[PDB]
Amino acid sequence: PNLNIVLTCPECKVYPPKIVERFSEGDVVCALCGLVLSDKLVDTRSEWRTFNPLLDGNNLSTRIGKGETTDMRFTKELNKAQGKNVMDKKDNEVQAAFAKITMLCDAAELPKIVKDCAKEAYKLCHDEKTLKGKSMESIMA
Amino acid sequence: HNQFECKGCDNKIDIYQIHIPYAAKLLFQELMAMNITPRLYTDRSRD
Amino acid sequence: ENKDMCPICKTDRYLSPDVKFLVNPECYHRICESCVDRIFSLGPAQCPYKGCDKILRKNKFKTQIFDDVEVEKEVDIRKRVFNVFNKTIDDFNGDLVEYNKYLEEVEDIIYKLDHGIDVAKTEEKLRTYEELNKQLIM
Amino acid sequence: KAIPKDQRATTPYMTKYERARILGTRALQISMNAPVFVDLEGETDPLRIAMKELAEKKIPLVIRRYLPDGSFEDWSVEELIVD
Amino acid sequence: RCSFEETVEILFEAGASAELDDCRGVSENVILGQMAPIGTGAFDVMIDEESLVK
Amino acid sequence: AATLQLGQEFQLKQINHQGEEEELIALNLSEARLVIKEALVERRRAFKRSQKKTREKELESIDVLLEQTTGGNNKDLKNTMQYLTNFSRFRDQETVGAVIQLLKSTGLHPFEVAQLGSLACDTADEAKTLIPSLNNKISDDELERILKELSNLETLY
Amino acid sequence: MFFIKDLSLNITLHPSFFGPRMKQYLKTKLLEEVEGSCTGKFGYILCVLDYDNIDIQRGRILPTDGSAEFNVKYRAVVFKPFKGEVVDGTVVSCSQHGFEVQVGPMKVFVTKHLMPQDLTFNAGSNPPSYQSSEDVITIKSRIRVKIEGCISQVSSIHAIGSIKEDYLGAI
Amino acid sequence: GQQYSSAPLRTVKEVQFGLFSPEEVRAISVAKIRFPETMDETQTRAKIGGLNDPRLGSIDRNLKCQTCQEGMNECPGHFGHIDLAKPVFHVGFIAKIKKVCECVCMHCGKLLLDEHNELMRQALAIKDSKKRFAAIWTLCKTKMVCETDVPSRGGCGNTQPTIRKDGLKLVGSWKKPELRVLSTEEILNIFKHISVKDFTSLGFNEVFSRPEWMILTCLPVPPPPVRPSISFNESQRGEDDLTFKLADILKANISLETLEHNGAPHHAIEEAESLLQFHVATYMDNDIAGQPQALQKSGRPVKSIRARLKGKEGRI
Numbered sequence A: 001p002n003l004n005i006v007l008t009c010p011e012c013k014v015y016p017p018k019i020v021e022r023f024s025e026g027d028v029v030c031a032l033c034g035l036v037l038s039d040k041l042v043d044t045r046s047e048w049r050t051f052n053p054l055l056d057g058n059n060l061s062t063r064i065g066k067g068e069t070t071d072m073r074f075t076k077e078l079n080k081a082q083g084k085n086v087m088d089k090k091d092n093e094v095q096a097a098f099a100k101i102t103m104l105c106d107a108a109e110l111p112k113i114v115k116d117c118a119k120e121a122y123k124l125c126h127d128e129k130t131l132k133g134k135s136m137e138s139i140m141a
Numbered sequence B: 001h002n003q004f005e006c007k008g009c010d011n012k013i014d015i016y017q018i019h020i021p022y023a024a025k026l027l028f029q030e031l032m033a034m035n036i037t038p039r040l041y042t043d044r045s046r047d
Numbered sequence C: 001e002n003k004d005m006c007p008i009c010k011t012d013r014y015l016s017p018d019v020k021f022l023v024n025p026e027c028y029h030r031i032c033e034s035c036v037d038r039i040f041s042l043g044p045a046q047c048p049y050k051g052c053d054k055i056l057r058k059n060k061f062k063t064q065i066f067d068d069v070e071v072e073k074e075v076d077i078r079k080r081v082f083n084v085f086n087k088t089i090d091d092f093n094g095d096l097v098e099y100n101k102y103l104e105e106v107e108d109i110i111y112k113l114d115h116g117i118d119v120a121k122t123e124e125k126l127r128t129y130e131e132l133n134k135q136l137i138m
Numbered sequence D: 001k002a003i004p005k006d007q008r009a010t011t012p013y014m015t016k017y018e019r020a021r022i023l024g025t026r027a028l029q030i031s032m033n034a035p036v037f038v039d040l041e042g043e044t045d046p047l048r049i050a051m052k053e054l055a056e057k058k059i060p061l062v063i064r065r066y067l068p069d070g071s072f073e074d075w076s077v078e079e080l081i082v083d
Numbered sequence E: 001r002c003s004f005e006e007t008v009e010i011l012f013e014a015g016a017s018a019e020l021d022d023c024r025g026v027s028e029n030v031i032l033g034q035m036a037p038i039g040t041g042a043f044d045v046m047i048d049e050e051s052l053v054k
Numbered sequence F: 001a002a003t004l005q006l007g008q009e010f011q012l013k014q015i016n017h018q019g020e021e022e023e024l025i026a027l028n029l030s031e032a033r034l035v036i037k038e039a040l041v042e043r044r045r046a047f048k049r050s051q052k053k054t055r056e057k058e059l060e061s062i063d064v065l066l067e068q069t070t071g072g073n074n075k076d077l078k079n080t081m082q083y084l085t086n087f088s089r090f091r092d093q094e095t096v097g098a099v100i101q102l103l104k105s106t107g108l109h110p111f112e113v114a115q116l117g118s119l120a121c122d123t124a125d126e127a128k129t130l131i132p133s134l135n136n137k138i139s140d141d142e143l144e145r146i147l148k149e150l151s152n153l154e155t156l157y
Numbered sequence G: 001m002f003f004i005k006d007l008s009l010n011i012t013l014h015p016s017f018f019g020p021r022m023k024q025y026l027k028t029k030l031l032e033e034v035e036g037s038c039t040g041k042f043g044y045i046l047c048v049l050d051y052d053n054i055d056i057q058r059g060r061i062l063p064t065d066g067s068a069e070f071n072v073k074y075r076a077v078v079f080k081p082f083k084g085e086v087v088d089g090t091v092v093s094c095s096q097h098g099f100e101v102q103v104g105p106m107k108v109f110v111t112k113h114l115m116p117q118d119l120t121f122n123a124g125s126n127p128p129s130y131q132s133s134e135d136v137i138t139i140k141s142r143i144r145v146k147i148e149g150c151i152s153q154v155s156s157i158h159a160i161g162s163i164k165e166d167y168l169g170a171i
Numbered sequence H: 001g002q003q004y005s006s007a008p009l010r011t012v013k014e015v016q017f018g019l020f021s022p023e024e025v026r027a028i029s030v031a032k033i034r035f036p037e038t039m040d041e042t043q044t045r046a047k048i049g050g051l052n053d054p055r056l057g058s059i060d061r062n063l064k065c066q067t068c069q070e071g072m073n074e075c076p077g078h079f080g081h082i083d084l085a086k087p088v089f090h091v092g093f094i095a096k097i098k099k100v101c102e103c104v105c106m107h108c109g110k111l112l113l114d115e116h117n118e119l120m121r122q123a124l125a126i127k128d129s130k131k132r133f134a135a136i137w138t139l140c141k142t143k144m145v146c147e148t149d150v151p152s153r154g155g156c157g158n159t160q161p162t163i164r165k166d167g168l169k170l171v172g173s174w175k176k177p178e179l180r181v182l183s184t185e186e187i188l189n190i191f192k193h194i195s196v197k198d199f200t201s202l203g204f205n206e207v208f209s210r211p212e213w214m215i216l217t218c219l220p221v222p223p224p225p226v227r228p229s230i231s232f233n234e235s236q237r238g239e240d241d242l243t244f245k246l247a248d249i250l251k252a253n254i255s256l257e258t259l260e261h262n263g264a265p266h267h268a269i270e271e272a273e274s275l276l277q278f279h280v281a282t283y284m285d286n287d288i289a290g291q292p293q294a295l296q297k298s299g300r301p302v303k304s305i306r307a308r309l310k311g312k313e314g315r316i
């Protein structure tokens, strides 16, 4: 429902926003009357400094491993709990398939581009109806 | 349209405006995310 | 009765019967509180008491200790007509014959009203009420 | 709760902080087109005009000195002995 | 107290025990971002309308 | 609602600016016009003091002479004067004093007597239906009598 | 209802208004803002009684900007609607959902569903009028409306009325 | 440079610190957040009802933040929530709750000893709340049996067990020896049976703090104005660590509800309950001693709120 902010100059109002963005001053200004359109400009490079949608999608997950000061009993109970919830999603085949495909590509000394193209192809096929089997070896080859 | 509300306490009249730094607002929102209430009052109830 | 007191709330004995059951004088039908309040609150309409069509008005209710609709109507009309006739030519001099004859006429009027006859004599009794009221005003 | 004039027991001398805020607020008002009570000798800077008004006690202000118990006093800058 | 060292523990104990702050401390007025009662701000400046007619 | 339970600022207990206790002042659409039209006169005297150094035509003309006094930002008060005047049947503060004498004689709430004096009714059922707070707090014959004396106090102006 | 209440307002003045006559300015502002405006807590403010004995109290200086703040206590005549309140009014605008009654400074709306069944909407007339079985509701016609609910928004108050019940409708 | 507002401008004076009640959390929040996914299925906009939906705050300037409208330079943010089907404990209160478990009966919910004891009479005269709770704890932690009749009193009598902290849990030891682990629902029930004089004698204020409120039931969800995500090159989008923690809380909560809906293996229910307790515990404080440390998929520990409020050069 709308939610689209469009910057316009109320003094000029003669054309769609043909503006200039001053990053050093942190403003955006109309290149005609010289009137600023917005102050306090946000950055995208600065938030990126601390840090894959193409393959993993929007799914999120976090690992549980052992801690600095912890017991080995709690590490097993948390991993066994995830082992019971691993059936909630059918994405175990993508990680194992990409693992074995990773082993074969690393065994063939092929570049990473062919690895990403092959993983993308297997992601395009995945589990469709026209495949109807092939025992996971033929779709990988 | 000059309209205000506060969810969960039935107010549409008595709304106060305060100027605080954005970092302090980050502190208050992190306390609310940590189940801590940083209630702010413009009047002195203790006197 | 314990099985009929509101067409929607006919059995509220196991729901803690804490609501009263009002009766409109133009319907003589039992309606519980939460229903009648919405009835006259949304507008003066008729109650669906077994397909009742007489309009239920706002307020003007009454508490009933239950003495049958016949006797309740006969005592309401009895008191109303008793107030319309008032004490005209009653204890004016001390006569017993004409007094008892006039009381017989009044009770016969109340009888014709509680029976209705054919909706013809009762209208003449209404004109008699207007005449008696005109005599009381003067 | 406003101590009366016969019970004001604070220092009658204007401190450097009171003189500072009086010259700052007065100069800020003069910068915002305030009625000047002293004839100018050709000044243009607002702070110099504020100090010119303080030198003749023509500043129309009164200080509300807060006491630690919650009370306060009203010492006008005209009756305060400067320097 | 929370500003100096152990922030989270002091805050948690505060919220747990329903503690109230007077908010005339130095760091408190700093955090909220308004004038503190120190020096110039330790007194309010008023106006006397009876002095304007002088 | 209309169950003698108004808001906080509209409660029966009010406090003036001096600190004393005062009952809620409820006005009907009779003296409410003479109070606005009244205070606007002394306001005109106050505007002409510092300057040194049939029933509808007079209403709108006086509303124009008072509109020149104000800064042209309160015409809803003048349209409210036309509303009240078009819905008012009372006149002169003496008769209004008599009306208050008839309303306070029953011992009712100020809002109730305001709704009594502000509405034109002929029978008691009209006053009991238009005013849900009054249905058993006062006798019907007394209300009919008040409507009779009021009917003798109203005059076509 | 037309009530009288003592209200208090904080007036802000620019440092350029600190002349000896500033009190007058105060009253001036105290009129220009209060008379005619509206509040969601006290209703539509009509007039302001007592113009000579207006208390000024003491003016305080807020930090930045140097503007002056005043707390004024006065007596004023205001108009506040109430829920379930029988009032009278005259129609201004007409709509298929109902005609908009004008009660003083408030424009009450009456929903078509809150009207009796005999009252029907007529658009073929100029202006469109609501014709019933005996009464014809037009713009210049006077109608007694029973207000059912009121909304108290800040500086804006609208109410909803009805005429379905008895002793209501056109006057 | 922000937009003008007609609200009265005042300074900030008194600041009150209190616990968040679950009812107030549900009254402040606007969304439920059920989908652990970040963005929508079409790889654009937002998930609408997920970890970062338009019902919360937004960044990127261009977006309007549905429920405030205006912009990101004006949006304070908006709060979501998470309604759990199993109550969990808060890290910073695990000790305090334990102390409460050593200050009140575990059945009738009444304070140990009574006002007839002289030491309790002396301890109640202290005006400081923390010292009162300390001394009263030192007295009540020794007596391990409620009593019905005390010579110059409530009933019960049931032997009060010994509460020990172990793996974010509280195990109760009965000598009678019968050792049983105290669940969160039982402790919360006993806390629901606490009288006013009891917790107010411990240092709680009814309008601000409650022992029932100390046990976490509903969880507030902070808006992206607190955890700003990034979309770099439109194909390298990074989400904050708290977002991943919320995804873990959602997966563990939905998993626990699914395991508790159909059947009951009794062991997978405890594994999923300890899993949700671990995700909430690491969400509040990841650097908890005696517990495993959650690590991100990049190779770095998960950044929690406590880490933002603890180390130097942080928020303070």
Ligand SMILES: [Zn+2]
Pocket: none
């Ligand atoms: Zn729409």
Ligand SMILES: [Zn+2]
Pocket: A009, A011, A012, A030, A031, A032, A033, A034, A035
């Ligand atoms: Zn421009």
Ligand SMILES: [Zn+2]
Pocket: C006, C007, C008, C009, C010, C031, C032, C033, C034, C035
């Ligand atoms: Zn019923």
Ligand SMILES: [Zn+2]
Pocket: C026, C027, C028, C029, C046, C047, C049, C052, C053, C054, C056
């Ligand atoms: Zn019926």
Ligand SMILES: [Zn+2]
Pocket: H056, H057, H058, H065, H066, H067, H068, H069, H075, H076, H077, H078
């Ligand atoms: Zn927002």
Ligand SMILES: [Zn+2]
Pocket: H105, H106, H107, H108, H109, H110, H146, H147, H155, H156, H157, H158
């Ligand atoms: Zn016990």
